[PDB]
Amino acid sequence: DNVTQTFKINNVRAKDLIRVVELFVKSSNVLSVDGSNLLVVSAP
Amino acid sequence: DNVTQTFKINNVRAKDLIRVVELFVKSSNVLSVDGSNLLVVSAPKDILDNLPQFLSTVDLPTDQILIEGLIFEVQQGDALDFSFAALSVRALKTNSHSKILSVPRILTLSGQKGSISVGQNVPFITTVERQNVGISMSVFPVAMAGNIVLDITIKADSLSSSTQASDVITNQRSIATTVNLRDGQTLLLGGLTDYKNTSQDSGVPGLLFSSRSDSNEESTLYVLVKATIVR
Amino acid sequence: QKGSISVGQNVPFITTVERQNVGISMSVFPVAMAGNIVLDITIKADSLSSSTQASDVITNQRSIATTVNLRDGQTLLLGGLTDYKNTSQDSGVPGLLFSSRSDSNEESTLYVLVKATIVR
Ligand SMILES: C[C@H](CCC(=O)NCCC[N+](C)(C)CCCS(=O)(=O)[O-])[C@H]1CC[C@H]2[C@@H]3[C@H](O)C[C@@H]4C[C@H](O)CC[C@]4(C)[C@H]3C[C@H](O)[C@]12C
Ligand SMILES: C[C@H](CCC(=O)NCCC[N+](C)(C)CCCS(=O)(=O)[O-])[C@H]1CC[C@H]2[C@@H]3[C@H](O)C[C@@H]4C[C@H](O)CC[C@]4(C)[C@H]3C[C@H](O)[C@]12C
Secondary structure, three states: XOEEEEEEOOOOOOOOOOHHHHHHHOOOOEEEEOOOOEEEEEEO | XOEEEEEEOOOOOOOOOOHHHHHHHOOOOEEEEOOOOEEEEEEOOOHHHHHHHHOOOOOOOOOEEEEEEEEEEEEOOOEOOEOOOOOOOOEOEEEEEOEEEEEEEEEEEOOOOEEEEEEEEEEEEOOEEEEEEEEEEEEEEEEOOOEEEEEEEEEEOEEOOOOOOOOOOEEOOEEEEEEEEEOOOEEEEEEEEEEEOOEEOOOOOOOOOOOOEEEOEEEEEEEEEEEEEOO | OOEEEEEEEEEEEEOOEEEEEEEEEEEEEEEEOOOEEEEEEEEEEOEEOOOOOOOOOOEEEEEEEEEEEEEOOOEEEEEEEEEEEOOEEEEEOOOOOOOOOEEOOEEEEEEEEEEOOOOO
16 A cells, blocks of 8 residues: 555545545545644555 | 654644544554643654654644624613693603723634633522633634634623512623634624613593603624734 | 643632632643744633622633644744723613713724744
């Protein structure tokens, strides 16, 4: 394997897009750094 | 195998970057020495070779936001009691005006909660439970790209002299919402305008009492909010 | 490390009683970085009221609690509240002729500033 990247969320709070992104990566793997609206995801 | 290195965190507290760094190393392995903002991580060397470039995408300079609430209540008002007992003639012409402008302010880092409360702490029977009664504004802003998403509660309360109930009656005024603000914009987070035009008139369709009341209350409350990214 | 300063009065409050500081206090938890300081801060400025309108003692409160980011010798407006009340009243006649008139023009402003300095 899993790489870990950070994604900048621009329009919505990154915290609301955790469950949605938990599905995309499903097969804690998604976290939100609330300060700088970022999603750290670990997945293939 | 595991090497153990220390990494200096420069822009954010090293304690907030523990869960994030726990993922990068996942396959207690990350600890924070809070004094000198350091992260001690234990993981294979390979993993620990790429940690420098992850901490340059997660350890960024956070922005500070200046929320500036604005509460504004104008209350006009009039009246005209007018008896004509038949020859006593009572009258009255009470006017009244009121302008209250309360401007609360609070600076907070993005992604942190901040609150300002100025008023009185009053005990309320429930056994007693104390509770702030005055102007308060709790904020939780998150800056994005600039825009700010802001969860906000503005309460403007006061105590009443009414003894019509078990305990103390409070005069309440509250908004709680989440909005989206630009970097230096004012929004109408809400409001309430009110208008009462009461009118009364007892007459005769030997004494001849013949009163007449009137009233024309008008009130308007606005709650505005201006957020500004400090950087 | 956490540090706090509290100067005021310790007042008992019915809840059974529970004591509680009522005065100026400032609790801090700073972390210096590279210089910058991230500071979790609560400043409370309270006093006792003479009002007996309630079960127990009413306190006059003033508090900020936030987290901010300060440089090595900067002052920030950690917050504040300005207030303005312009009340005006006027009973008249549209044989006695009572004809009162009140007015008022309260204006108030509170500022809370904070200056952190790394000693080394
Ligand atoms: C008398 C003030 C003037 C405010 C002003 O001129 N500008 C805004 C910023 C205020 N500041 C916090 C910077 C100043 C505080 C003084 S301080 O001591 O902080 O320096 C406010 C209070 C009520 C306001 C109106 C109502 O809402 C209705 C309406 C809503 C729209 O949305 C914008 C248009 C409109 C017509 C408003 C215009 C104006 O806005 C008014 C007259
Ligand atoms: C009268 C004092 C003067 C303070 C001063 O001159 N400098 C700051 C440091 C104070 N010290 C702790 C070092 C001295 C204490 C005395 S000691 O006994 O500790 O030595 C303070 C109290 C209210 C202050 C203003 C308001 O906030 C609004 C505004 C905010 C901005 O942000 C900066 C600009 C401005 C216009 C402010 C200027 C100034 O700031 C004022 C007049």
